Amino acid sequence: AERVAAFLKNVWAKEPVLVASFAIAGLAVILPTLSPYTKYSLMINXXXXXXXXXXXXXXXXXXXXXXXXXXXXXXXXXXX
Amino acid sequence: XXXXXXXXXXXXXXXXXXXXXXXXXXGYSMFAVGIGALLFGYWSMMKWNRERRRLQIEDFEARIALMPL
């Protein structure tokens, strides 16, 4: 080792708070790209309606039913 | 007989000794509790946030269900 293990312990000796400022902030960029859970959070964010539902005129349409409990469009069922 | 001030030895009080000593935390042990509290912290917090989603959709559903409003 030349700078991986040799230079890392020098930061711990003088001004040790500098280690945490690079490590914690560094992991905050790497983790949201590789972990297989980040795509689930966007799904619920799009599913939650802020505005009222809009009614469209039906003339030969697939996956569209009444407001009553029936299999239509998609409807969120991701984890309970 | 003449009486004056008397000397006492016994233990001689024990002068100049370091009474300061490290206690409880050592170094590596406290970091295992520190990150351990963080790992327990985020995991328990996000479970309530997922439980909030059950309420979140259901609360906004009231506006969609009520159109005579």
Please report residues of A whose CB lies closer than 8 A to that of B56: 48
Method: cryo-EM
Maximum distance among all Cα pairs of chain A, rounded to whole angstroms:
74
Distance CA A70, CA A64 (A): 9
Note whether B60 contacts A52, CB cutoff 8 Å.
no
Q: Which among B50, B53, B60 is the nearest to A49, CB-wise? A: B60
Distance CA B11, CA B21 (A): 23
For Cα atoms B63, B64, B65, give the angle at the middle one, nearest 5 degrees.
90
For Cα atoms B28, B33, B35, give the angle at the middle one, nearest 5 degrees.
90
Q: Which DSSP state fits A80?
A: -
Q: Which among B50, B56, B63 is the nearest to A48, CB-wise? A: B56
Whether the CB-CB separation of A44 and B53 falls below 8 Å is answered with yes
Q: Which DSSP state fits B24?
A: S
Spatial neighbors of A11 by CB under 8 A, at least 6 apart, are A18, A19
Backbone phi, then psi, for B49, in 5-degree steps?
Answer: -70, -35
Resolution in A: 4.3
Dihedral angle of Cα A78, A40, A56, A66, to the nearest 10 degrees: 0
A48: closest CA of chain B, how far (Å): 6
